Every structure is written in C-alpha cells, then in structure tokens.
A paper describes a structure:
In contrast, PfA-M17 demonstrates a restricted specificity for Leu and, to a lesser extent, Ala. As in the case of hPheP[CH2]Phe, both zinc ions of PfA-M17 are tightly coordinated to one or both of the phosphinate oxygens of compound 12, and the latter can also form a hydrogen bond to the catalytic carbonate. With such chirality, compound 12 is still able to orient its amino moiety towards Asp399 (interacting with the latter via a hydrogen bond) and at the same time to direct the phenyl substituent towards the hydrophobic pocket formed by Met392, Met396, Phe398, Gly489, Leu492 and Ala577. Disordered electron density for the carboxylate and leucyl substituents of compound 12 is observed in all twelve chains of the PfA-M17 binding pockets, indicating substantial flexibility of binding. As a result, the complete compound could be build in only one of the active sites (Chain E), and even then could only be modeled with half occupancy for the flexible carboxylate and leucyl groups. In this pose, the carboxylate forms a hydrogen bond with the main chain amine of Gly489, while the aliphatic leucyl group makes no interactions and is exposed to solvent. In contrast to the structure of PfA-M1 bound to compound 12, there is some discrepancy between the docked and crystallographically determined binding poses of compound 12 bound to PfA-M17. Unlike the experimentally determined structure, the docked pose shows that only a single zinc is coordinated by the phosphinic moiety. The amine moiety is also oriented differently: rather than forming a hydrogen bond with Asp399, it is directed in the opposite direction and forms hydrogen bonds to the main chain oxygen atoms of Thr486 and Leu487. The chirality difference between the docked compound and the experimentally determined binding pose is, therefore, probably responsible for the observed discrepancy.
The P. falciparum alanyl aminopeptidase, PfA-M1, and leucyl aminopeptidase, PfA-M17, act in concert to mediate the final stages of hemoglobin digestion. PfA-M1 coordinates a single zinc metal ion, while PfA-M17 contains two metal binding sites. The two aminopeptidases are each encoded by non-homologous genes and have been validated in vitro and in vivo as drug targets, as inhibition of their activity can control both murine and laboratory malaria parasites. The X-ray crystal structures of the potent compound 12 in complex with both PfA-M1 and PfA-M17 were solved to a resolution of 2.0 and 2.3 Å respectively.
Author numbering:
A (entry chain B): 501 to 552
B (entry chain E): 86 to 135, 137 to 254, 262 to 602
C (entry chain D): 85 to 254, 260 to 603
D (entry chain C): 86 to 602
Write the structure that this text describes.
Amino acid sequence: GVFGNNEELINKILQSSKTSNEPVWWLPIINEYRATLNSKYADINQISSSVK
Amino acid sequence: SEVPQVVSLDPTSIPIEYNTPIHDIKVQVYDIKGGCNVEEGLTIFLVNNPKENGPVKISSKVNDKQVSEFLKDENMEKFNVKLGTSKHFYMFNDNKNSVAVGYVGCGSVADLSEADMKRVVLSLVTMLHDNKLSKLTVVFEINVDKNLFRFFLETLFYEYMTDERFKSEYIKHLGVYINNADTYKEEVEKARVYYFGTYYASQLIAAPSNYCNPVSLSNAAVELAQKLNLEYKILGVKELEELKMGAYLSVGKGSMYPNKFIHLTYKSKGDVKKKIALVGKGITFDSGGYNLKAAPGSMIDLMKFDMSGCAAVLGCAYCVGTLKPENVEIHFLSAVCENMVSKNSYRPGDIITASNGKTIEVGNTDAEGRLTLADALVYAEKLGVDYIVDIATLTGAMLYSLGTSYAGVFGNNEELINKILQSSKTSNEPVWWLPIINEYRATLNSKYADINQISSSVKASSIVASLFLKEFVQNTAWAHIDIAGVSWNFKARKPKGFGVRLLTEFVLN
Amino acid sequence: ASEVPQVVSLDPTSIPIEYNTPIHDIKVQVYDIKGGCNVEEGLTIFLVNNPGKENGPVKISSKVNDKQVSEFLKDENMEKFNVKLGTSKHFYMFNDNKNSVAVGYVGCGSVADLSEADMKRVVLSLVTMLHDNKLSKLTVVFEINVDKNLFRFFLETLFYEYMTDERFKSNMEYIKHLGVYINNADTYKEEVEKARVYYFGTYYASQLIAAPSNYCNPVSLSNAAVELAQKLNLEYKILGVKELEELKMGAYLSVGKGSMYPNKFIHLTYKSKGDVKKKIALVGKGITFDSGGYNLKAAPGSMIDLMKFDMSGCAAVLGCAYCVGTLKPENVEIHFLSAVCENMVSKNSYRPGDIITASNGKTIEVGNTDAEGRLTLADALVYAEKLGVDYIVDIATLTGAMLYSLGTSYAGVFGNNEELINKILQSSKTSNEPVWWLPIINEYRATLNSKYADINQISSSVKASSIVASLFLKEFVQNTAWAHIDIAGVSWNFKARKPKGFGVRLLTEFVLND
Amino acid sequence: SEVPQVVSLDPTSIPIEYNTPIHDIKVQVYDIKGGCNVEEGLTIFLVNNPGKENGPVKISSKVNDKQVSEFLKDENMEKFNVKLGTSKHFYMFNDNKNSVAVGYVGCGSVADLSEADMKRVVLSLVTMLHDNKLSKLTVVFEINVDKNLFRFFLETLFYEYMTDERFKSTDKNVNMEYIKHLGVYINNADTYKEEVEKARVYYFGTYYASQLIAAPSNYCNPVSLSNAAVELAQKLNLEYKILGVKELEELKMGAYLSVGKGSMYPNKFIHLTYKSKGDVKKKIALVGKGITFDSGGYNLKAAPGSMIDLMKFDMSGCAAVLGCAYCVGTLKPENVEIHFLSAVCENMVSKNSYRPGDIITASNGKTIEVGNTDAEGRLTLADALVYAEKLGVDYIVDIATLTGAMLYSLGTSYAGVFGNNEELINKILQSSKTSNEPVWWLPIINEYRATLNSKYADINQISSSVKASSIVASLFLKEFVQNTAWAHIDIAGVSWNFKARKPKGFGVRLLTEFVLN
Ligand SMILES: CC(C)C[C@H](CP(=O)(O)[C@@H](N)c1ccccc1)C(=O)O
Ligand SMILES: CC(C)C[C@H](CP(=O)(O)[C@@H](N)c1ccccc1)C(=O)O
Ligand SMILES: [Zn+2]
Ligand SMILES: [Zn+2]
Ligand SMILES: [Zn+2]
Ligand SMILES: [Zn+2]
Ligand SMILES: [Zn+2]
Ligand SMILES: [Zn+2]
C-alpha cells in the first residue's frame, strides 16, 4: 500500500511500481480519524482509541 | 406475503413513517448582500478563521442594532472557531422580541470535507434539540459549492429527525443566508428528497429483525412500489426453485421466514438509452449460521444491519421514482433472507449449486452474503442491462482496510468504477477504489466443487469475496460496493443510511 | 397437568420426586448433657473443641454410663488425637454387655463460636462417618456452645447432607434413631420438627434443580408444582401461552419462543385461616435450561453443562411453599410465582437486537439473548405488583458476576426499600443462609437508555452486571417494596457437585418472622 | 535520591504544579438576601423546580438591576426548563449601559441533589467556562445545600476547571484563560464562608494526587515519587524518612523486596509523619499502594481487557495518601498523630524478577507462596502493614488499586471497604458521607481462608478455587495485622475516570475527613 501527502509523488511511486513490476496500490489518508489520535496529556497519541 | 408468527405478540409489519416533521419545514434561501434580518428564533453563523483555534469574527451585516452590538469584534473574539465548537445566547432585539444568536466554528481550513461538515451540522443539531424553536436561520460565512450545500441540508434534516417508532416540537421555518443564493435554491427540494431516501433506508436498517424479516421487508418494498408507481414482482420459494437459485435458497433454509426475492423496476417515459441493475444484500439477520457469531468482537447484536444494502437500493428507488430521470430503466433487486441456526440450516462443508450451474463448496456459513448475491447477480445479468452495481455489508475486513468512513468499491470495468467514484464526489458519500487481485483467485479452487466460497489461506477477505462474485458476472460491466465498515454509525448508535444518495447520483448523472 | 411433549418415546415425561425420605423415619430425642450420657447403643460422637490451644488435644468431659467406653475416653488415650476443625476418629468396641458400639469425636477447632461455615465442616465430617455406618442409632454429644438457630442449622445440614439423591441411578444403612445431648435440652426440642420441615423444603428444591433439563422442563416442572399444591392444599393456577398472550407478557414469551416446550407461568397461593395482615409475592427465576440462545454459551468457563441450575430461583420458591404450607403461619397471604421457560437455539428463537414489549407497556431492546432471566422476571414482577401485595421478593441465578463479587458463599440482595432489605438480612441471620446487601447505583441507569426502545436489556459498557440487572428489574416495580436476591454464585455446590437448595430457609424465615 | 536513566533523555523528576491558576482566584461569598449585583462576565443561577419534572425556570432571587430583572421575569423564562444538567446563556445591557452575560444551570426536580447530581451540575457550569474568555464568575444558589455539599460544589468546580498541561508541548491550548474572580451568592452566607478555603485545600490535595497518578511511569518511578514526597514533606514541615533497599533488607521485608527485584529503580519506602501539638488522642497509620507501573511481571498483562496502558495508575493509593498529607499538613488538626506510608516499587519483567512459584518471607516471618506475580500489591502491602503495626497505632487504614474484580462488584462509582473492626469501618463510611466520595462495605468471608492454605509455605498469595479476588485479597492482608483495628479500601474500580480519560484523585478527601473528625 502507498499513502502520502502529495498526489504528484504518489503517482511517481505508482509509475515506478509499473516499470519495476513491484505492485503497489494507493490507499487514502482519511483525516476524519485524526481526532482519535488526540491525547489528554501529550501532544498526540501513538495509536488510535477507536479506529481499527 | 402473510408474516408468520411464533406467538400472537410477534410483529407482522415494519412500522414506517412517510410524513416526517422535516417535510413541514418551510425553507427560504436569501442572498447575504443586503444584510441579514434577525427577528425570531435562532440565528447561527457558520464561521472559520483561516488562525488555528482563532477568534470568531462575523463579517455579515445584521439589520438589527442590538444584535449587531452583540456581534461586534470585541465580543466575538472571546470565542473560537475550533471545528464543531459552538456558543449561542438569548437576547432582546430592536423590537424587544426574544431571539437567540450564535455560531458554529468551522475551523481554519477554507474548504470543508464531508466529515468536517458532518461535525458542523452535528453541533447545530445539538442546539436544535435543546431549544424550543419556531425557526432556525443559518448564515454561511464559509465557502461551499452546490453539492456541499445540498449535503449540509440532507445531513441537517437526517440528524435532526428522531426515530421514535419503537418508543412507548420541531422548527417550522429554515432560513439560509448565503452569497449568490439564487444558484443554491434548486438544491433545497433535491435535499428533501435525498433526506427521505436516506431516512427511509435508515428506518429499515434500524428496525429489529423480529420486525424486519424477509416477508415484512418485501411487503414494505411492495408498498413503496405502489406509492411510486413502480412495477414490482416478489419471487417466492416456488419461483426461486424453478429458477434454480440454490446458493440463495441454501442460506435461508434455516429460517422460519420463506426467502423473498425483491424486483422493482423504474422505466422512463421516453426511449430507454441505459439499463441498470442495482443489487442489494438483504440478510435481515445474520446469526452466522452453524459458524455462529460467538467470538469476541463479532457484533452479533447489530446483525440486523446486514440488510443495509437492500435498504440502500430501496431508498434509491424512492429518490429515483420521485425525481423521475429520463432515458433510463432501473431494476432494483434484493435476494432477501435470514441466516439462522436450525435442524434445517445449511452446513459447513455443504456443496450447493448456483443458478448458473456452478457448484460451490461452503467453507463457512457466515460468508452467506456472497452466496445470495451470486444468484442475484446471475439474475440481474439475464435482464440484459448495461450496468450491474451491488452494494453489501459483505466483509468485516473492511473495518481494517478503510475503517468506518470510506466504503470500498471493486469492479471488472474501469469506466463503471470511475462513474461510481464521480457519484461519490457529488453525493459526498466517500468511496475508495480497491483492487480485485487475480493472483488470489487460485485459493478459491475447490478440491471437489467448481469453486470455494472462501479462501483458507488469504486474509484479504474483501478482495477474495470480490473475486468470488466476479465469477457470477460473465459479460457485463459490474461494480461492487462493500459497506460493511460504513453502514452503521457506532458512535451515534444508529444507521447512516449509506449508499442511497451515492446510488441516486449514479442513476441521475 | 399438561402433556409433556417428546421427541422420541424414550424422552421422560415427568420429574421423579421422592417425598418420603429415610430422613423422615429417624426418631430424634434430645437429652440434657448435665445428666451424663447413655452410650450403650450404636455410634456415639462427641463434638469437642480446645479453646486457646490451637489444634490442641481432645478431652472429653461428659460422664458416660459404660465402663468400657469410659476407659476409652480417658485423657491419656484421647490426647493422642487433636481438635483441628473437621478432623475425626471413631473406634468400634464392646460395651459392658458385650454388644458392639462405636465411639468417636469431630474436632470443632479452637474458637468457641462456630460459624455456619465451620458447622457445615463438622457435619460433613460426621456425614462421612455415617456414610460408612450400619449401626441403627447415632448419638451426638455437644461439648461445645451453640444457640437455638445454629443447633437447628446443624440438624438441617446433617439431614440434607446425609440424604443422597439416587433417582437417576439404576456399605451403610440409614439410622432409625438420633440422640442429642446438649445444654438446656428442653429449649432446643422445638427446633427438631422445624429442622425436619426446613430439610425437606431444601431437599425438594434440590431435587428439582438436580433434575436434568430433559427431565425438568417447563411442562414437567409446572406439573410438579401442581402436584405439590394438591398435596399441601394450596390454591394453584398454571397460565399457558394463550393466557400469557392475552396478558401481553411479550418479554417472557420472547425468551421461550425457541423452545419445544410451551411457557408455563406458575402461581400458587397460601392464604391463612384468619384475618390477612400481610400479602407477600415470592418470585423465582425459572429457566429450565439456559443454552444462552443465539448468544450461545461457548466461551471457556461459561459452564453450559450446569445450566439446568437456572431454575434454582423457582425451586427455592417451591421449596418455600412446602415449608409454608406445612408450618401454616397465620395472618399472611403468600403468592409463589415463577415464569417458567426454556432458552434455546432455533429458527423460532428471539434474536439479539429484537425489540420486545413487556406487559406494562415498556419496549425493550435485547442486547444479549443470554441475559434472559431479567426478561422473564420483568413480566413476572408486573404480574406480582398487580396482585396488590405488601412485599415482592424475587430470587434468581441472575448474574455470573456474583462469582467475582461475593463468590460461592454469600448471595447478594438488592432493593428499593431499606426496611424490606433489613428483614431479608434478619432472615439471613436466623436461617444461616448468608446474604449481603449490595447497592443499586442510580448513576448507572443512564447506561440502560436505548436509542430506539424505552430501555436496554443490558449495558454495553458498565461491567457491574449485578447492579445493572437490578436497575433493570427495578423498572418493573412502580410502588411496592421490592427486593431481589441474586444467587448465581451460591446456588450450585461445585466442590460437592450438587445443589445447595439455597433460599428455601431464607424465604421461609422471612415469611414466618414478619 | 538520584534517579537512574537509560539514556540522557529519561526524566529525572515528576513535573509538579503547586501554584495553580485556581489558587489565583479571588473568592467572595455574599448573602442572597442583599440581592445580586450583575456587573460583569457571566452570572449563573442554580435553579430547580420541585415536583414539576422538567418544570419552568423561575428566578427567585432579588436582582439589583432594572434591565436584568426585566430580562429574568417569569414570562421570559418559562420557555426554559430545569432538567438537570441543562444550561442557557443570556446577553443584555444592565443599568450602567454595560453588556453583561447571564444564565442558569438546571438542578432538576429533586430538592436534595446527590453527589452524582451535583457533579453533573458542575460539569455543566464548567462547559460554560471553557471556550469563553471571562475574568469573573458569579454563582447564585437558588437550591438548598448543606455545608458539606457546598464545599463539594467548590472542590469539584475547582478540580474540573483545572486543566493539566504538564506534558503538552507543541499543543498547549492557545485559548485557555482562567477567571480571576469567583462570586457566590447564597442564603445564610457567613455560615458557608469557612468552607471556601477548606474547599481550596481539598481541591489541591486531589489535584496533587491526580498529578502523580496521571504522570507516566517514565516520569513517576519509585525514586522520583519518593523524591516528590520528601519535597512535599519539606514544604509542609512534616517529619520524613525514605527507607532504601539496605534498610528494607535489615527489616526483612522480603515480600515487598521481591516485587521490586526486577526493576531498574531501587525500592523506596515513604514514611511521612504529622503530629499535633498537645495531647495525642489518636495515632493513625495510612497505607497506600505504590506500584509506579504494574506490568504483571512474568504473569504479564497480555490478556484482552488487561488495561496495561493504564497501569501507571497503580500508585493511586499512595497518591491518595500523599494528597491526604498535603491537606492534613495544611489544616493542622489537633490531638492526632498520622503516619503516611507507601512501600513504593515497580513490577517489571527482567532476568532479575521474582517468578510464579517462588517462596518468599515477609517481615513477620510468614512464608508466602507466589502463585501469580501480578498479584503484587498484596505482597507490598503485607510488609507495609507489618511495619505500620510496629508503630503502635490505633487505626491502620490502607487504600489500594488492588483488584480488577471491583469493576464487577461495585463498578466505577463506589469504592469497596473491608476490615477487621466494625467501628473503624463505620468511621470510614461516615467519612465517605461527609467527603462525598462513595464507599460500600463489603465482607471478609472467612470460609475462603482455607483456599489460601499452601502445601509448602505458611500461606498462599492467591486462591486456588475462589474468583472473588477482592475478598481473597482482603483475607490475605488480614494475615499481617495481628491486633490492630484495620480497614482496607479497594479503589481499583473508581480511581480512573474512563469517560474523562483522567484520574479522579479518589480518596484524598475521604482520608482527610477520616483524620479530621
Ligand atoms: C466470513 C467471515 C469472515 C464473516 C464476516 C462476513 P459477514 O457476512 O458475516 C458480514 N455480515 C459482517 C459485516 C460486518 C462485520 C462482521 C460481519 C466478516 O468478518 O467479514
Ligand atoms: C453471560 C452473562 C450474560 C451471564 C449472566 C446472566 P445468565 O442468565 O446467563 C446466568 N444464567 C448465569 C449464572 C451463573 C453463571 C453464569 C451465568 C449475567 O451477568 O448477565
Ligand atoms: Zn455472515
Ligand atoms: Zn452478512
Ligand atoms: Zn443466560
Ligand atoms: Zn440465566
Ligand atoms: Zn498486578
Ligand atoms: Zn497492581
């Protein structure tokens, strides 16, 4: 799976996937899940409370 | 279509409300130029600050001097725009009439996602449920296209509506202030139709399995068909036997309710230029069969939701039959049954024959959805359609790939897949494209039957299930939407009614 | 009665009940210990302690009327043995007249005040001697201090543990005489026939519980109640399915839907001869087998093979009807209620998620079909309150969690009325069936709020199951003093592999001393 | 005293806040019969309506302002009900032609609010303080409360308002502002006045406890926690000693020492002492469980629902006792002598750990057979109880996160209390009433004692047969108190607020009330 913050770069990876015949598939970074990384005490949680 | 009972107390029909208080709300859209009038009820400004957790600043002119004083920058800067954060105050306006004024923070990103807007609306609804109001006014101080604006209304209507059918005062006016209001007016009634399609689907999903069973669910579809002047046909066990739907029929053998196959048709007045079949998974309760749902986390108490796909298709039938698109013929299908434990149930290991003649080895009686859909797909292709799209709560594995927000779409045809992706964009029901990986196909080779129902090895369940279904469509553009993850809103303890607007947008454009 | 449905013709159609036990043929005499002991017949056993000196030597104080036994009992010989609780020795010998007798002791520890748990150990040690005995008389000599209630407890426990249930089978001989020597004999004598009644009520409850679910089902159990009522001259009524439907007991009927046996609601009545000054309803959980339903008992530790015990509540209420109908208290009207059914897996069973409607009009969202007991109790409670009683007491194997809170010795009691709870606790003391008051914590009530129905059957979150179940039942009692006794932990004796018949004496003492 | 580290980025102390924003709040109490002034930011009426459920709001107070009075007339207010936890905000100009904020919080229909009800009320109030930059709050009491409930209102207002940001860095709340002034209007006010600063003391004890509990195990370890107690003792002028490994060995605390064998931090035994001037009428030992992290040991917490990520909280009892010491050391009660004790260590997995099966010796000569290394608390309490009784005290009270079994008996609201003496138990229950920290009495069932008989050692650590752990645990502890009144408060269920994701600081107020009255 490939995730990213930049469509151009994701596409370079996908194209590199084509020519190297190492199969990769673009998966989304779903921002709705970001709040489950909110920590009561630290800046951020390492893992999610609720999202599997 | 008589609903069998064990005791005389057993329900014989799904209760349905068609006339909801939302349908009595009078909606006006006003242009924001000219300024906002604040005369009654509750006025909410939707506000962002592109900064992070920045202060609230109201831009719009308000044609009331008391309320303008309340909305001046010195006072609003005590509040912030953190997404979903809200405040509202009661006060006297110029006329010494009591009104309430406040805001909903929309954060610090200019273009809200569907998830953000959901959060904004949820905050707005909290205020509506807590205040006896005759009228709500919403002032848009954020940017929003026609589709997101429509989405805001659908969502507001749906979240505002409270389902009370199993229990033993709403606003009468909605005002909207938005820049260039004339362009948005046409979305209002479209929203009302989409709202009810979603709420209707929700009503079937939320209705428990003693209420919503194969007979009462199919009775419900017939009632709907009649109200919309759609052709309808319910196939019963005798018909299904002549049609040799062994995969479908085997799932339902353990039930006290006969299998009921739903087939609604919409045909446009003019020439038909496109034929479509929408196929929904219709398991009214999934106990898992002899592979009982007994493991920790198997969520047996929510398995009334396993008919969500069928619900989605019927909600679409409502929208389509109301908005009357042209040059299309739509078949609405669902192979409805119940997956139970009984002396009559199908067993792990059983070899059954689908209606296209393929023998299947059952490896797990809790992978029932793909067997009923196998026969529904074969049926749909025989209709001679251009597109087959199924929607289904098919694999719990979805929770581990996309989670609870995005449905997955699989398909055998890139054009169809992109049509669904576009429909996902305009309906704001998020879907993501996932691969049908042919290297896994061999794990479905049965030693004895033509094909295995499940893989023993490969844990990529959503993909294997797609690979299974792909065998039952030979020559038609077909896509499959797996909504196992997104159908039920766990936080809110209710259905989303996912899929209706998605499918409808697909049919309409 | 009703016909018991069968699958095959080898299926039993009634519960075998022994009414006339060997226990009833024992003649019981109580003598004052101040006068010395007559040890010329059978097995004589001294109950001895040694205060202060932990595990101290045995020492017999009593004068006996036989020279051979006297020499055996002298200190030089008895100090070979010690008093560690439950430890025993007994010896065969010839008395002065060359007849065969046997003499021993049971240690009662080094603490002067025996608890009921300690007493049970002593009795068990005694029962072990009896289970290998063929002499016709047993004499027990109390060289320890007990009060009236504990003495009655000793007799009841001796009788219950002595009796062995052989109804399902295809060495020793029961004694014909029991002799007791104890201080103040005359004041203890009136406890003997009360103990005999309390014993059989308990034993009768035990026989129903122990009876497996193929023998004991809703039809055979309700039949047994009818037969009991007839032997005791009690008013009875059995409500079948059509009557239950008319009364709208939708929660109760949902639980039974998957069974091959028709639901049977049991209602027996004792009415006193004179003026009636208190009306009580006793309500018993009556699940003749709890498979769990679709939420099947499949997890490790879930104890599915023992789930014939799940009508223990019912058994205890019926055992109480035996005691009450025999002892005939005055000024009281008592109703004995159990909504009996079977919780099974079937095409016809109720499902997780189903919304059902109780007879008081409340709708209930079923979270877990294995939380079946509170559903059947909910309708039974609505039935009881409609009788206009002063007190409703229910008793039930309701929550496994009791095993984690009070364990296998004490039951929990919950209630909406402080006075009724104190009466239960006082009944606990005099019956020596230990109970402990637990709270009904209102803060948890919100967890029962359903999104669609009027109320949830279970909490999703809150793990305090016994409190949550109590909160739920509470919703079906509008304005009557009500208590709930959860015996899921104490009902089955895991070590001895048998029931305790827990509750018969508790409830009987409750109705007798109000 | 020196905290060992693995790498230089390892913390060497617990960050502790003493001067909190709550402490800078000027609090004034006024008598309601003088009438409310409404001049500045946010005035909240606490209002109920007995009998009429969800009944209308009516403001009974005399408000000394025409404009505001006109706003609060019944006619204006009838569209609002008093449903518990409900609030509204009002906005208007007063007589000085100044803008002003006004509102109410519904206190239901029952004239007597429970502590759970009052908590729901404070929570509602607090939401009106968050996300609103106010400099003053005034609360007008139009419900009836006794002096203990009023104090509880303030303690809870203070505690819930305070936001713990010691471990925030790039994510402090940019908009957090605390009021500087709190006004309270109430009937018969000068009776209530002395509750205010007591509330402030009770607030910090709880917050201090809470601060140690929330602090993660890399910050809060036996060295740093015992360092913190010293620091607290110095600030309060309490006598203190910290017993280290070599003195513990001399005291033969083999049970306590075994639990900590596997840790990189040396065991540290905290012993603080408050002594009244004059005649000492009561001597009391308070004993807190101080496992700074409970991994379970070789019986690792690896099962589903084991909550290993929360086990920084296993020092909650010790924190309760240090918080009590703050309150006692601040309020200076007469005629008592208090010892505050905690046998502090970490239960870890190492080549140096104690194993299941080990037989260890307690400081009173009893040999113990360890059946499960994750029942570590009762071992450390065994030695702490033996030490406590050696002080020759009248009452030993211990407080511990001892058994998860509490989640299945009383759940998350009530602590359990066990003991060998009825009078001491009842004093605890009494303190529970006036501290408003709920406790329920639970039995020590002697019949289970036999399941702790060991074949090889004097006694078993755990039961073979009995799933009632809280009771078995208490039976074990009883074995180490020979002739002293002793009670045991099991707070495993209530210590952590799962909904709010933070400590409750449970027990500080309880223990302080116990010591005070
Ligand atoms: C075949 C197994 C892997 C079982 C299921 C498929 P299902 O048909 O029971 C479906 N109803 C489901 C939806 C969401 C959550 C759980 C189950 C699975 O785990 O995907
Ligand atoms: C699995 C849970 C729902 C268990 C209990 C209810 P139960 O009715 O099955 C009862 N029969 C029971 C007794 C003793 C041991 C175990 C089970 C519960 O706490 O709700
Ligand atoms: Zn399934
Ligand atoms: Zn399914
Ligand atoms: Zn059950
Ligand atoms: Zn049960
Ligand atoms: Zn532990
Ligand atoms: Zn611990």
